[PDB]
Amino acid sequence: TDEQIYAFCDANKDDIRCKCIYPDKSIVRIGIDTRLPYYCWYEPCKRSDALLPASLKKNITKCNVSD
């Protein structure tokens, strides 16, 4: 469940796998300025061990990234 994943990364913010729930401030600004959300391009969110909610996964599909 997405709620469980969120709770886990709330406790473990600075874990690499939880940087798709809590990205560094520079990344957020870059995403705004490039007009594409951070999760569409950021490297820890293209990892296969990444902790990604189903809701977040849908959002990635809805920014229409081809990778």
Which of these, 26, 65, 23, lies nearest to 44 by C-alpha position?
23
Q: Other CB atoms closer than 10 Å to residue 19's CB: what's the count?
A: 21
Cα–Cα distance between 34 and 57 in angstroms, integer?
20
**Which DSSP state fits 67?**
-
**What residues contact 47, with CB distance under 8 A and at least 6 apart?**
16, 17
What secondary structure does DSSP assign to 2-64, as a single string?
HHHHHHHHHH-TTSGGGTTTS--HHHHHHHHHTTS-GGGT-GGGSSSS----HHHHHHHHTTT
Q: How far is CA 49 from the centre of its chain?
A: 12
φ, ψ of residue 34 in degrees (nearest 5): -100, -5
> Dihedral of the CA atoms 19, 50, 2, 38 (nearest 10)?
50
Indicate the burial class of 18 (C-beta count within 10 angstroms; 0-12, 13-18, 19 or more): buried
